[PDB]
C-alpha cells in the first residue's frame, strides 16, 4: 500500500519559518513522479504551492517564489516544505500529494492544520451537560460535553472511547476571544442513561491533554 503523511508544528508565530515533513511509504520518491505541497485555506480555496521531481528539480508557485523551499532526504524517503516570514494569512491545512495528470497514479496525504498566531497554547476546560429534568417521556435522551477555552485547533471528542458513535453530533469550534469553544451532543435511548455509564473523552494534542468526563445526573 502507498501512503503520504504530513508532520510538523500546528502552531507557528508570525514571522517565524514554517517547516513541514511529508513521509512516503510504499514507493520511492526517486523512481518516478513529482511530489507536491498544496494548501487549503479556511473557506475551501486550494492553492498549489510547489513540487520536487524524482530527479531533484523543483517548481514553485510564482506568488510564493520569494519565500518557498522544497528539499528532500532520498535516504529517508521524505521531502520537506519550508515557508518563510509567515503571516496570519498562512493559516491553512497543508497537504502533500503526488500524482500524474496522465497516468492513474494519484495520492494525497491526510493534511495537517497549521495556525499562525501570537496566542499561546491553552488546554481546554471540559464540562458534562446533563438534563435538568429533561429525561422524562420520550424514549431518547440527549447528553453533551462543553469544550471551551482551548487553543489552538483541534481537539478530538469521542463517547465511551468510540464505543458509542451511533447518534453523535460534534459541533465545529468557534473562535471567541483568541480561544475556541466547541460542543458535542449524543442521543441515547432512555435505557442506557443513567443506567449504564456514558463518558465523553476529550483530547487536545497541542497541550498533551487527555480528559474523560462521566455524565452523571444532577440531584436537583
Amino acid at each position: 500500500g502507498v501512503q503520504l503523511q504530513e508532520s510538523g508544528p500546528g502552531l507557528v508565530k508570525p514571522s517565524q519559518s514554517l517547516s513541514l515533513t511529508c513521509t512516503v511509504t510504499g514507493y520511492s520518491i526517486t523512481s518516478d513522479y513529482a511530489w507536491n505541497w498544496i494548501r487549503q485555506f479556511p473557506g475551501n480555496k486550494l492553492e498549489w504551492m510547489g513540487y520536487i521531481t524524482y530527479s531533484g528539480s523543483t517548481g514553485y508557485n510564482p506568488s510564493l517564489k520569494s519565500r518557498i523551499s522544497i528539499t528532500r532526504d532520498t535516504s529517508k524517503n521524505q521531502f520537506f516544505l519550508q515557508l518563510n516570514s509567515v503571516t496570519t494569512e498562512d493559516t491553512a491545512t497543508y497537504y502533500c500529494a503526488s500524482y500524474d495528470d496522465y497516468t492513474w497514479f494519484t495520492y494525497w496525504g491526510q493534511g495537517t492544520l497549521v495556525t499562525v498566531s501570537a496566542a499561546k497554547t491553552t488546554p481546554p476546560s471540559v464540562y458534562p451537560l446533563a438534563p435538568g429534568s429533561a429525561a422524562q417521556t420520550n424514549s431518547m435522551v440527549t447528553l453533551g460535553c462543553l469544550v471551551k477555552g482551548y487553543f489552538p485547533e483541534p481537539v478530538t471528542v469521542t463517547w465511551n472511547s468510540g464505543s458509542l458513535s451511533s447518534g453523535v453530533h460534534t459541533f465545529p469550534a468557534v473562535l471567541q476571544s483568541d480561544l475556541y469553544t466547541l460542543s458535542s451532543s449524543v442521543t441515547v435511548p432512555s435505557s442506557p442513561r443513567p443506567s449504564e455509564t456514558v463518558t465523553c473523552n476529550v483530547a487536545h494534542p497541542a497541550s498533551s491533554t487527555k480528559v474523560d468526563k462521566k455524565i452523571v445526573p444532577r440531584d436537583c
Binding site: 480555496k45 510564482p62 497537504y95 495528470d101 435538568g132 453530533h169 465545529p172 471567541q176 460542543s183 451532543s185
Partner: protein
C-alpha cells in the same frame, strides 16, 4: 493565473436524480501533445480531496460508473447520473496544462431532503463550571431540515442577544439533516440573578416556535 470558474457555487439535489457541475477556464486546456489536462476532485466532510477524473473523462480506480466527465477547450462538465448520500461534499476542477496548476472555487453539493423539525434540548450550566465563576447555557437543535433555523434566548422573559455562539454542522451524510449548537455565556453572578432561561427556535416546520426552558431554582 489561469482562472477556473465553477457553477453553481452550491448545488442541491434530490437523492436518485442526476446532477451537473460546470467548470470553465480563461484559456484552452488543450495541450500541444493533443491531451487535455483537467481533473475533478471531491472532498467529503472531514476528509482530503480525492481525484475522481483525469484527462477530462477518464475515471479513477474505484470511482463509480455514475460519474461522467466531458468537455473540451474551455468548457468541461461533471455529470452524476444518479446522486446518492455518499456524494455529499465539495467538487473541484483542477487544471494541469498551464503553470501554475490552479483549482476552481469548488461546488458544494447538498442533498434535498424532506422537511424535519429540530429536536430541542436545553442544558443548565454544570456546577463544575459555575465554580470557575462562569456560566454557559447550552441549547442543541438536532436533525432538522432545511438549514434555515433561527434561535433566540430569553432570560426572565426578556430577549438577550450578546454572548451567543452559534455553530452549524455539515449536512449529515446519513439522514441528510443539519444540527445546530447555541451557547449563551454569562458570568457566575448574572446567571444567579435571573431564574427563567429559554431557548426558542423558529423553523419552516412549524407556525409557532419550539420552546425549551428551565428554572435555575428547580435543580
Amino acid at each position: 493565473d489561469v482562472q477556473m470558474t465553477q457553477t453553481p457555487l452550491t448545488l442541491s439535489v434530490t437523492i436518485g436524480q442526476p446532477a451537473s457541475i460546470s467548470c470553465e477556464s480563461s484559456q484552452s486546456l488543450l495541450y500541444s501533445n493533443g491531451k487535455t489536462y483537467l481533473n475533478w476532485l471531491l472532498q467529503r466532510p472531514g476528509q482530503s480531496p480525492k481525484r475522481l477524473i483525469y484527462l477530462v473523462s477518464k475515471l479513477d480506480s474505484g470511482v463509480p460508473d455514475r460519474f461522467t466527465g466531458s468537455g473540451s477547450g474551455t468548457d468541461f462538465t461533471l455529470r452524476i447520473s444518479r446522486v446518492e448520500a455518499e456524494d455529499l461534499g465539495v467538487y473541484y476542477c483542477v487544471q494541469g496544462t498551464h503553470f501554475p496548476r490552479t483549482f476552481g472555487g469548488g461546488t458544494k453539493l447538498e442533498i434535498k431532503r424532506a422537511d424535519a423539525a429540530p429536536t430541542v434540548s436545553i442544558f443548565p450550566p454544570s456546577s463544575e463550571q459555575l465554580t470557575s465563576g462562569g456560566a454557559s447555557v447550552v441549547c442543541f437543535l438536532n436533525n432538522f431540515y432545511p438549514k434555515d433555523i433561527n434561535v433566540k434566548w430569553k432570560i426572565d422573559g426578556s430577549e438577550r442577544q450578546n454572548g451567543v455562539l452559534n455553530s452549524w454542522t455539515d449536512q449529515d451524510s446519513k439522514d441528510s439533516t443539519y444540527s445546530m449548537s447555541s451557547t449563551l455565556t454569562l458570568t457566575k453572578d448574572e446567571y444567579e440573578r435571573h431564574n427563567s432561561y429559554t431557548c426558542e427556535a423558529t423553523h419552516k416546520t412549524s407556525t409557532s416556535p419550539i420552546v425549551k426552558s428551565f428554572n435555575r431554582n428547580e435543580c
